[PDB]
Design a protein around this ligand. Structure first.
Ligand code: PLM
Ligand code: PLM
Lengths: 49, 49
């Protein structure tokens, strides 16, 4: 058959799952340390006092 | 004349100058925190006092 001129140029692309904006949590300033450290600091604080 | 099938597909495209290092601003020392944070710190300072 004899095609006509392309009316839509395309190709092979890459599709991935759209990511999320990862809205920071309210209490995210605690993230640098683990929950165990934060809990142990309170225990250490009480003990020292 | 009679053109053959396209061997290359092109379009209109924006050309600009490649961004270069931004000259540091006068009050650049305020960049690590957003304008909102600095404003809220002032409000928190007043409130706490
Ligand atoms: C003077 C010693 C204590 C200073 C105050 C530290 C405040 C942090 C304690 C509460 C955080 C507990 C962690 C649970 C939340 C989490 O990180 O998942
Ligand atoms: C307790 C005072 C802390 C120091 C506060 C310094 C900054 C005061 C002014 C805050 C608002 C303007 C500065 C941010 C400007 C911007 O980056 O757009």
């Amino acid at each position: 058959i004899d095609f006509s001129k392309p009316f839509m140029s395309l190709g092979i692309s890459i599709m991935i799952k759209k990511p999320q904006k990862s809205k920071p949590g309210v209490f995210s300033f605690l993230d640098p340390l683990a929950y165990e450290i934060w809990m142990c600091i309170v225990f250490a604080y009480i003990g020292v006092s």
